[PDB]
């Protein structure tokens, strides 16, 4: 099942930092 690399690596490469940075930027800039 070597096709899981095609679906975990782009999520951790792209989706994981986009979801993390967009959470943290809205959390540090929160009155």
């Amino acid at each position: 099942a070597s096709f899981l690399s095609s679906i975990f690596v782009p999520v951790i490469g792209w989706v994981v930092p986009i979801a993390t940075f967009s959470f943290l930027f809205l959390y540090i800039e929160r009155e």
Partner: protein, 739 residues
């Protein structure tokens, strides 16, 4: 005026970008949080320690799963001396087609990374044979790491949350951790070797299904209780034992040959079984010493405060005042953390010193690059654990230290004569450096002038003796286990040197790293190491002892541990704080471990290639280090990619250049300091409010330059990461390109 960071109202009321950076470097500092009390501190550290513990088991499970699913472990069993292991597989979209063909290696379908951490040798030694045991142990560590993630959550709930007196019960940790964490676990691993790993070493499968049926010994626990323990040391694995087969096998489970297995060139598994069994008895007995609620045992607070040796009045133990040290170790957490990093830092290097000379893993002495990486890894780990020992020891003297509770004791008497400690530390650093650098430059000029016989070469005749006082015939000193008429050789009253015929076979062979042959090139580098240890200690001790103030600046305790300076007054005070003496030392600590690992690596490149004469001639003068090691070995590396093509070393050729760039970037934060950069950002703030379309958007946090203490962190971070990655790309590919 935001609510981030939660743990500080002084940082959360910062309009600049300093708010963001100081949240990161004060987040895990639990002691400086807002409103943190004493018992809330320990209850939060204890549950955090379940968090770091469960990272370790989740880390070690990915080593098992990525090998079972993507590596070639079952293909590595058949021939461990030529089959090249596999760590994980590459899914990189950015690869070109000649860079998929170059990394399709070790008999695999796709691009794979050759494992240089030696975990196939450790798993093959301890009995694991197929890819299903690796997967089973992987899934077990998923559950065993979740058992700690639940435990840290459970011990934060209000009636499951431990009290303060539970943490400061120090005599009960020492009984349970020595007997149970050290002793039972050494006993359990001896049970794992005897039941499983030693029968797996003889071609005899023992798994979870048939370990209750099969016995490790055909005698079978009857000679244990009757006292006939010599039955366990009957016919061992012979000198023709082919590993994991039944040829030349034995029935013994606890044996004491000493020395190495003749094929794998590792320690005997029957020797390790009687080892961890004997360690287990010495620790369970050690864990029944201190006083708990059962009204028996030694009491440490009474051992410190004792003043009477059999009627004679003394000042304390060894007639030295150790009173109040129990209330100094136990009440402070930085005294404990500063202490135990020194304890863990000693043993970490002590692990590395005994794993190249005494290999304990099957077929690891012949897989070279896995052995060159494990030495250099645990040496650099031992570096940070020793620098942080003095670092967290110096946070103790600023923050936690109380001179009234510690009045008159041995830790007070060090702070009196602290100018005598730093002076004689400053002497040995200069006494070695003036005369070790002097003899390299002497040998450099003398060889350069074509007359190399005028070199000052000193045989290390005080370490020549120890290797001959351990049984090496090669020098002809004829003492002390190399003298066959010696009292130490024969063990005169009892003659019980069982280990000694197997030890002298191992030390007198030139086919291992056991007590390597030393010469005049090894004289200068051990005194160069001693230059690096006494000088790194000089910076760390002087920053520890002067942490509470001195002549140029008294009351440094009022300013905390990390503050920039005290201004340009009094001639200026740049890098005056106790944090700044942590800071200068990590240049030396990375330096000294460079010297101990340039010298480790180049002595073994002569052993592994059969050319011992290259090191012994050329390691006396500093061109032979520069030419025959740095220049000559980086030819396989740098040709990892050239205009003709690529090969499998092109990551290490790319990481080598990457390391030279992170290293050089860190100079920018150290040569140039802050006030140049705040006057540069104030021109970018101007030209953003004036640009007509781009001033629709605007910052929430005002851009300021990095603070003075911050870009000494950030400067040391680019320096240290680039120092590691440069050598780690040179260590691997110069060894894995030559074998």
């Amino acid at each position: 005026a935001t609510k981030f960071p939660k743990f500080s109202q002084d940082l959360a009321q910062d309009p600049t970008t300093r708010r963001i950076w100081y949240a990161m470097a004060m987040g895990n500092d639990f002691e400086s949080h807002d409103g943190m009390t004493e018992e809330n501190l320990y209850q939060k550290i204890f549950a955090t320690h379940f968090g770091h513990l469960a990272i370790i088991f989740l880390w070690a499970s990915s080593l098992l799963f990525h090998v079972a699913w993507q590596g070639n472990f079952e293909q590595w069993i058949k021939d461990p001396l030529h089959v090249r292991p596999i760590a994980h597989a590459i899914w990189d979209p950015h690869f070109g087609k000649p860079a998929i063909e170059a990394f399709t290696q070790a008999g695999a379908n796709g691009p794979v990374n050759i494992a240089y951490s030696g975990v196939y040798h450790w798993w093959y030694t301890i009995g694991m044979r197929t890819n299903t045991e690796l997967y089973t142990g992987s899934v077990f560590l998923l559950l065993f790491a979740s058992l700690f993630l639940f435990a840290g959550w459970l011990h934060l709930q209000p009636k499951f949350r431990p009290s303060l007196a539970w943490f400061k019960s120090a005599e009960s940790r020492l009984n349970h951790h020595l007997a149970g964490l050290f002793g039972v676990s050494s006993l359990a691993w001896a049970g794992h070797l005897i039941h499983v790993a030693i029968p797996e070493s003889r071609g005899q499968h023992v798994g979870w299904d048939n370990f209750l049926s099969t016995a490790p010994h055909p005698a079978g626990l009857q000679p244990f209780f009757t006292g006939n323990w010599g039955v366990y040391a009957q016919n061992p694995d012979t000198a023709g034992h082919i590993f994991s087969t039944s040829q030349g096998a034995g029935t013994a489970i606890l044996t004491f040959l000493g020395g190495f297995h003749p094929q794998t060139e590792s320690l005997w598994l029957t020797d390790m079984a009687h080892h961890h069994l004997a360690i287990a008895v010495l620790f369970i007995v050690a864990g029944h010493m201190y006083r708990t609620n059962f009204g028996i045992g030694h009491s440490i607070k009474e051992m410190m405060n004792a003043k009477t040796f059999f009627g004679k009045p003394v000042e304390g133990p060894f007639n030295m005042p150790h009173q109040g040290i129990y209330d100094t170790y136990n009440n402070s957490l930085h005294f404990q953390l500063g202490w135990h990093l020194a304890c863990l830092g000693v043993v970490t290097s002590w692990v590395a010193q005994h794993m190249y000379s005494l290999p304990s893993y099957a077929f690891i002495a012949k897989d070279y690059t896995t052995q060159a990486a494990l030495y250099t890894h645990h040496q650099y780990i031992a570096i940070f654990l020793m620098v942080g020992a003095f670092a967290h020891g110096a946070i103790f003297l600023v923050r936690d230290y109380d001179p009234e509770q510690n009045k008159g004791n041995v830790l007070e008497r060090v702070l009196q004569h602290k100018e005598a400690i730093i002076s004689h530390l400053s002497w040995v650093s200069l006494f070695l450096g003036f005369h070790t650098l002097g003899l390299y430059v002497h040998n450099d000029v003398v060889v350069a002038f074509g007359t190399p016989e005028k070199q000052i070469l000193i045989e290390p005749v005080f370490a020549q003796f120890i290797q001959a006082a351990h049984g090496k015939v090669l020098y002809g000193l004829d003492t002390l286990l190399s003298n066959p008429d010696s009292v130490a050789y024969t063990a005169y009253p009892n003659y019980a040197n069982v280990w000694l015929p197997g030890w002298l076979d191992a030390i007198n062979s030139g086919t291992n790293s056991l007590f390597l042959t030393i010469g005049p090139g090894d004289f200068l580098v051990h005194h160069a190491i001693a230059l690096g240890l006494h000088t790194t200690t000089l910076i760390l001790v002087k920053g520890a002892l002067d942490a509470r103030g001195s002549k140029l600046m008294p009351d440094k305790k009022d300013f905390g541990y990390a503050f920039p300076c005290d201004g340009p007054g009094r001639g200026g005070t740049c890098d005056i704080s106790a944090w700044d003496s942590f800071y200068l030392s990590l240049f030396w600590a990375l330096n000294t471990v460079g010297w101990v690992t340039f010298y480790w690596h180049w002595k073994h490149l002569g052993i592994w290639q059969g050319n011992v004469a290259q090191f012994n001639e050329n390691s006396t003068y500093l061109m032979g280090w520069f030419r025959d090691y740095l220049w000559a070995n980086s030819a396989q590396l740098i040709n990892g990619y050239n205009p003709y093509g690529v090969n499998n070393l092109s990551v290490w050729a790319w990481m080598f250049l990457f390391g030279h760039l992170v290293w050089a970037t860190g100079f920018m934060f150290l040569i140039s300091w802050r006030g140049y950069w705040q006057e540069l950002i104030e021109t970018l703030v101007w030209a953003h409010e004036r640009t007509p379309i781009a001033n629709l958007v605007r910052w929430k946090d005002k851009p300021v330059a990095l603070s003075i203490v911050q870009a000494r962190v950030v400067g040391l971070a680019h320096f240290t990461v680039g120092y590691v990655l440069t050598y780690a790309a040179f260590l691997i590919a110069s060894t894995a390109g030559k074998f």
